[PDB]
Amino acid sequence: FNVMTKMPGKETADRNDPYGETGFSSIKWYYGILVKRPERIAVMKAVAPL
Amino acid sequence: SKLPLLTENGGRVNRVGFTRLSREGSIHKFGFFYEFTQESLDFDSDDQLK
Known about the structure:
By secondary structure, chain A is mainly β. Helix content of chain A is 0%, strand content 20%. Chain A is elongated, with a radius of gyration of 23 Å. The PDB classes it as virus. The entry lists the keywords Moo19, virus.
């Protein structure tokens, strides 16, 4: 996980928000899969009671 | 009514601009004279007319 925080202050000022009040915190990540032997994964579907 | 009032959502609010004026002043030329003749300072009643 990559977490990028920019606390309100000098690091959030811009010509759009000259006072610098709003910050944020963003978490971005990569994920993938490589099914090599799908013959070994087995599923089974059925309904369930209330 | 016109007081600068901020909110939490600090943004493009309360913009102020300034002006710069100028003041001038000129220069003018004056002068005068008078004429006399040698026949008015040679035989004249006073010795120190000039």
